[PDB]
Amino acid sequence: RPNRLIVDEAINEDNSVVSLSQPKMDELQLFRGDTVLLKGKKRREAVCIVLSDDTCSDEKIRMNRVVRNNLRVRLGDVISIQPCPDVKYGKRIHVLPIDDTVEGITGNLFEVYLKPYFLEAYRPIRKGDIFLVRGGMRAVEFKVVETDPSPYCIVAPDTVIHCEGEPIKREDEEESLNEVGYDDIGGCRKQLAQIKEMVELPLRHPALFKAIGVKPPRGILLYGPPGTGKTLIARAVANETGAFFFLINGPEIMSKLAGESESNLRKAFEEAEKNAPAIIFIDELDAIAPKREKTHGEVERRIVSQLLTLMDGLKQRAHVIVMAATNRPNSIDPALRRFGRFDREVDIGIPDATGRLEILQIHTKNMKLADDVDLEQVANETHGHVGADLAALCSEAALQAIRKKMDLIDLEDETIDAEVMNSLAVTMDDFRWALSQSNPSALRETVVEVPQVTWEDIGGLEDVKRELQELVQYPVEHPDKFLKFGMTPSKGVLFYGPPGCGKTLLAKAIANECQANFISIKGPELLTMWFGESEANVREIFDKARQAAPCVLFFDELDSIAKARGGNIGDGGGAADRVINQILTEMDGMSTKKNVFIIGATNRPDIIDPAILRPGRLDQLIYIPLPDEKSRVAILKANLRKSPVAKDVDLEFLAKMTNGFSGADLTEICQRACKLAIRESIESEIRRERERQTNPSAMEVEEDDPVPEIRRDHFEEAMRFARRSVSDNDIRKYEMFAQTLQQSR
Amino acid sequence: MSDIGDWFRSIPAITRYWFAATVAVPLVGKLGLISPAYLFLWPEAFLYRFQIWRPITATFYFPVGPGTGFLYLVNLYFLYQYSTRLETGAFDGRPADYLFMLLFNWICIVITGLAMDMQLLMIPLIMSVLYVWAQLNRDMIVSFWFGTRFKACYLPWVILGFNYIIGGSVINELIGNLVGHLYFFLMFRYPMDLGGRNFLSTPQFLYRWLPSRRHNWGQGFRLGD
Amino acid sequence: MSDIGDWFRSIPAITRYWFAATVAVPLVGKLGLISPAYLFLWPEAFLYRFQIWRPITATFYFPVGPGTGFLYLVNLYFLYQYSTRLETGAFDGRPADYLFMLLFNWICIVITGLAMDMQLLMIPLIMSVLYVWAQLNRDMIVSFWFGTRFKACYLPWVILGFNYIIGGSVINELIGNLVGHLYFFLMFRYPMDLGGRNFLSTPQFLYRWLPSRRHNWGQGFRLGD
Ligand SMILES: Nc1ncnc2c1ncn2[C@@H]1O[C@H](COP(=O)(O)OP(=O)(O)O)[C@@H](O)[C@H]1O
Ligand SMILES: Nc1ncnc2c1ncn2[C@@H]1O[C@H](COP(=O)(O)OP(=O)(O)O)[C@@H](O)[C@H]1O
């Protein structure tokens, strides 16, 4: 039977498209756009339109949420298809809204929702179908009650749409096309994939695990900053697989009186036991099971021990999976981590720029944002926000945009009109205004993400580029050639040279090329855990680096400890040596299975402790020389990307005349020239505006604002006020140390 | 805006007429225009004399007094509460079936009341329609303000105990239970137990008088472009 | 599902049968099948003529009516909730002893009723068996749903206070609360104190058809050869 397939989520959001594989469509003699009849479980049928796809396999069929709900199936099921290309054009269709969706709308729904939806699509429908339409600020579901001819018809420009009558009652077969699901999560693809796999295995076919005889997981621990969407992940999994999600709240349990708390918890577990394969979610685990030293009373110990006993009391029976959410995975009692209890940990990190863009795309789906906003800019300027903050931002922007329309809906009625909703649009000004008075909550959090700097941003330095490519890319991209034949890859590279030559840029560039996470630990924080704080921080720094492998750990200004050590204090040298002991101790503890790369940068190479300079640690040395050749011209292009022009001030002459300068100096020159251009443009605008105050609109020839047109004079004036930061002594010291490194050893 | 007006108007037609009659008859009966003796369904009078005066009024005239007002009001409330729910329950269309059920129950109850020596033909009919509604709407849990989660198919027995301990004349409630059970067996249980043809069938005369409501379309619009 | 069926079947056969008779006989009398005039336990008629109907019919038929069914319901609930407790308490292994106690109580109550001038010999038996249950189940707290608790072995006094204010027939229950104490003395108090008079001996002609509970053993089959 080359008919049955497997259902999976689709990437196109239309309600009448299912994606096959080209070989399967070719075998079934079906062409693009041909109508099909899809039949699923419970003897429910629906009609749909097929299309082409890129990477879908032969046995997989892609469809969105509406079609899956209509067929009354779930993910991972099977369907039987049938090509039925004899659809007859319809004549009259009766469609009615559902009761619990149109509360306070009134108006005429046909002219607002149905007409744009049913135009130039020829959407096939079938009697009893349910479809969802996005409107002003809500999503309204419409149910087809009857058609002609029955039961298949195609909407055509000549039809008799009846949309009159009372709304119909929601039935008890379809759960809802409005609750959470896999299409309501963004920026967490990898972790969602892991959880989906690990929970789809037991919750679908328990008998397979019974017959095989392996041990399914009995506990999953999710940890991350608050407001990143953990409860939502658990709810989505439970509502998609099919279960009896039963939330338990930590403060609710602790708020009881003495002996009834553990009794309530016991009824919770026994109920979830005898209600079929279910998921138990414990929110705010640290609120009820903190570290032993934190507790001072006695009821806390009793509650913790009761939880542990009930956890150990689960042995097979119904496959009940326990999930728990905690803020930071060290306040939990260490007793709750042995095998047979919470053992598998999944991290839910703060989203990056793409994650924020996707969250904004998800949350503003109902709105009717005007064709002037740019979500990319708002996405990439809001670093430091979490999902909840972005949702609040969208809500506030909508509220602000609707505030300045009270005149149109003055009093009106308790049921707001319909066309006023379609009269509302949200512009960039509203989003910026909501941005202004908004405070994020991440801030002081380590950021892990793939840097966007590419190879062209760096000018010159070919040999260093090749050496980094050899040392980093080869051991990972072809691990077979390294497991065969016994080569031990290096664990670290140390950068040294004149200051401001682009060490951070090289590190970020190789991190981007390798497509690996990047973690930067800068000098100020390093000295912050040096004095005042303790050295326990390095432990979780290395742990976080290990968690997100592969990664490129970066230690900047490694010589700060020695620079502060040598002076007239002589009290904290112990702290510096503790920093070095921590770095060395967790540096040697790394294993070769994981790919963690350590890179250090410094500008006083002769002052670093010789303990680090040793096989098994940071051992290769790379010397980045002072810039030369028309690679500084490429540098100038790198920061002149966005800057408009240069006309006739030949940059090659500047490169010829500016020998012995680092990158920071050239970037300073470019910024100074741009500042002069801004000053000139602003003074010209002010001259024009104070001139227009005398002659009213006396402008025969129309000139717009002066287009950014940087001349040579600005650049020459900026160049006059320029010097060289690095003296001639430092380069000679560096070359002396290089020669000593070459000869002495 | 008379709430009583549209409240009455929204009632289904046959329930509307029945409620109007069962409220209107007692008022005139207590006014004194017609003596109670004219309306009791006297068995020997009906058998010997044709007495076309009392084939119908036995279910409309009720001697309300300060000894049975609570029973009267609670029965009227039960009628109002469950007759409409049965009307909207699986009986939204084809009212002829409901009317035939009512008329058959009326004929059989009148015949058996002639067989016994009973007078007031209201309680058995109301309780029997409640019983058949509960039986067709079984397995669902519903109760009163203090009744937590009482299950269905038990209310008839509860009201039996109530009106037996508080009141009397349990014979007519018993015969209401039997007539409801036999009608359920004949209309529903028999055609699926043995597959026999429907012994009871609605004649086309009632369909002529009471056509079943079909799907209505109203007026719509052309999609155009 | 037949919840009522399993609820009835869970009751022991003797208790179930007796409860069913005591709840069905009054309904039969009320339905008019038999005139109640023959069911009053006439003292003079029973003394003159044997009239075998009366000694058995006076223990079951209750002319329940408005204003008097509360006592019927409360004693029925007490019967149902306290008969099985004593049945499985200490006489589960010897149901013949329980039946013999019931027979002795019936004989005493009918003898006194013929001697005295009461007609309904049901409530005294119920309150006497409640008294003997309380005496055999002393030292606990009395359930009281809408309030606090109480102390055991005071159940007969509570019943005496309850049935005195509501209705009457205080003499009947006063007489009834003597046979239980007499049996407690003879069967229980006498043997440990004197043990001389051993007239209380259950015969065997009922042992033949009333064996003990035993290991039950279910049923078996003969393997044969
Ligand atoms: N893709 C997403 N990632 C993170 N948060 C989201 C996402 N989509 C929506 N949210 C918002 O995040 C909130 C999740 O609740 P949250 O406070 O994270 O639970 P918890 O208190 O367990 O952390 C929801 O209110 C939801 O509006
Ligand atoms: N190929 C290059 N050579 C030198 N400098 C460059 C090059 N490409 C970019 N730059 C500039 O050098 C700066 C990098 O400085 P950075 O490396 O952060 O200072 P430090 O070397 O003290 O860490 C960037 O602002 C960038 O504009």
Question: Could you tell me the CA-to-CA distances from A10 to A18, A31, A64, A449 in Å, in that order?
Answer: 8, 20, 5, 27
Residue closest via CA to ligand 2's atom 27 equals: A667
Cβ contacts of residue A420 below 8 Å, gap of 6+?
A405, A408, A409
Residues of B in contact with A95 (CB under 8 A): none
Q: What tokens were used for B49? A: 């004399």
Q: Which amino acid is present at B224?
A: G
Tokens 């939330």 found at? A247
- Residues A342, B220: Cα–Cα separation, whole Å: 60
* DSSP letter for each residue of C154-165: -HHHHHHHHHHH
Ligand 2 atom index nearest CA of A461: 1
In A56-129, where does DSSP find H-type helix?
65-71, 115-117
Distance A567 CA to ligand 2 centre (A): 30
Q: How far is CA A640 from CA A431, A632, A647, C77, in A?
A: 29, 12, 12, 96
* Secondary structure letter of residue B38 according to DSSP: G
Q: Are C14 and C97 in contact (CB under 8 A)?
A: no
Distance CA C123, CA C172 (A): 8
The reply to whether residue C64 touches residue B165, judged by beta carbons under 8 angstroms, is yes
Decide the pairing of beta strands A551-555 and A517-521.
Answer: parallel
Distance CA A71, CA A161 (A): 24
- State the helix-helix crossing angle for B13-31 and B95-115, rounded to 10 degrees: 40
Ligand having the closest approach to the CA of A636:
2
Of A89, A85, A98, the C-alpha closest to A144 is A98
Cβ–ligand 2 distance for A635 under 6 Å, the answer yes
Task: For residue A372, give Cα distances in angstroms to A129, A390, A397.
Answer: 36, 20, 15
Virtual CA dihedral for A346, A348, A349, A355, nearest 10 degrees? Answer: 130
Question: Roughly what angle, to the nearest 10 degrees, separates helices C13-30 and C95-115?
Answer: 30
Asked if A53 contacts A120 with a C-beta cutoff of 8 angstroms, the reply is no
Cα A664 to middle of ligand 2, angstroms = 6
Q: What are the chain B neighbours of A115 within 8 Å (beta carbons)?
A: 223
Nominal resolution (angstroms):
3.6
**Rounded to 5°, angle at Cα B179 from B177 and B184:** 95
Cβ–ligand 1 contact at A199 (below 6 Å): no
Token pair of B224 as six digits: 């155009």
DSSP class of B213: P
Q: What share of residues in chain A are helix, strand, coil (percent, to 5)?
A: 40, 15, 45
Pick the ligand that lies closest to the CA of residue A523: 2
Q: Which long-range contacts (CB under 8 A, 24 or more apart) does B178-187 make?
A: B179/B105, B179/B108, B179/B109, B179/B112, B179/B124, B179/B128, B180/B127, B180/B128, B180/B129, B180/B131, B180/B132, B180/B135, B181/B131, B183/B101, B183/B104, B183/B105, B183/B128, B183/B132, B184/B132, B184/B135, B184/B136, B187/B101
Run of H or E residues at A687: helix A663-691
Subunits with 3+ C-beta pairs closer than 8 A to A = B
SS3 A144: strand
Q: Give the phi and the psi of residue A365 in degrees, each rounded to 5.
A: -75, -35
C neighbour chains, 3+ CB pairs within 8 Å: B
Question: A185 in ligand 1 pocket by Cβ < 6 Å?
Answer: yes
Tokens describing residue A94? 């009766």
Specify burial of residue A716 (Cβ count, 10 A radius: 0-12, 13-18, 19+): exposed
Q: How far apart are CA C32 and CA B168, in angstroms?
A: 12
Question: Facing residues of A167 across strands?
Answer: none
A165 touches chain B (CB under 8 A): yes
d(C-alpha A729, C-alpha A626), whole Å: 13
Question: What's the token pair of residue A47?
Answer: 């009609």
Ligand 2 center to residue A456 CA distance, Å? 13
The whole-angstrom separation of Cα A496 and Cα A693 is 60
Sort strands A139-146 and A130-134 into parallel, antiparallel or unpaired: antiparallel
Residues A312-345 as b or e (16 or more Cβ within 10 Å = b): eebeeeebbbbbbbbeebeebbeebeeeebbeee
Widest Cα–Cα separation across chain B:
78
Which residue's structure tokens are 């609360």? C177
Whether the CB-CB separation of A320 and A197 falls below 8 Å is answered with no
Q: What is the DSSP letter of A342?
A: S
CA distances from A202 to A77, A184, C176, C214 (A): 15, 24, 67, 49
Q: Is the CB of A186 under 6 A from ligand 1?
A: yes
Q: Contact A92/B220, CB-based, under 8 Å?
A: yes
C-alpha torsion sign, points A629, A632, A633, A635: positive
A358, HSE (Cβ side, Cα atoms, 13 Å) = 12
Whether residue A499 has its Cβ less than 6 Å from ligand 2: yes
Contacts of A137 (CB under 8 A, 6+ apart): A366, A367, A398, A421
Does B220 sit within 8 Å of A162, measured CB to CB?
yes
| Distance in Å, CA B181 to ligand 2 centroid | 93
Cα(A459)–Cα(A637) distance, integer angstroms: 9
The answer to whether residues A402 and A424 touch, using CB atoms and an 8 Å cutoff, is yes
Q: In this structure, are residues C131 and C181 in contact, taking their beta carbons and an 8 Å threshold?
A: yes
How big is the CA angle at A52 (ends A48 and A54), to the nearest 5 degrees? 135
Alpha helix locations (H) across A529-606? 537-547, 560-565, 573-588
Residues present in chain B in total? 225
Query: What does the DSSP 8-state code read for residue A98?
Result: B
Ramachandran assignment for C43, one of left (phi > 0), alpha (psi -120 to 50 degrees), beta (any other): alpha
- Hey, is A160 helix, strand or coil? strand
3-state helix/strand/coil string of A60-75:
EEECCHHHHHHHCCCC
**Cβ-contact A73, A7 below 8 angstroms:** yes
Region of A743 (left: φ > 0; alpha: ψ -120 to 50; beta: rest) is alpha
From the CB of A500, is ligand 2 less than 6 Å away? Answer: yes
How would you classify the pairing of strands A124-126 and A35-39?
Answer: unpaired
Q: Which numbered atom of ligand 1 lies nearest the CA of A355?
A: 1
Rounded distance between C-alpha atoms, residue A185 and residue A240, angstroms: 13
Nearest ligand 2 atom, CA A503: 17
Reduce the DSSP state of residue A150 to 3 states and report it. Answer: coil
Q: How far apart are CA A586 and CA A551, in angstroms?
A: 15
> Which residues on neighbouring strands pair with residue A51, listed in sequence order?
A19
A-B CB pairs within 8 A amount to 39
The Cα C52–Cα C152 span in angstroms is 40
Please state the φ and ψ torsions of residue A164, each to the nearest 5 degrees: -115, 150
* Alpha carbon separation from A523 to A386, A520, B171, C72, C189 (Å, rounded): 27, 10, 97, 91, 96
DSSP per residue, B159-188 = HHHHHHHSS--HHHHHHHHHHHHHHHIIII
In this complex, whether B and C touch, counting 3 or more CB pairs under 8 angstroms, is: yes
Q: Specify whether the CB–CB gap between A87 and A47 falls below 8 A.
A: yes
Alpha-carbon span A160 to B219, nearest angstrom: 8
- Give the chain C residue nearest B157 (alpha carbons): C4
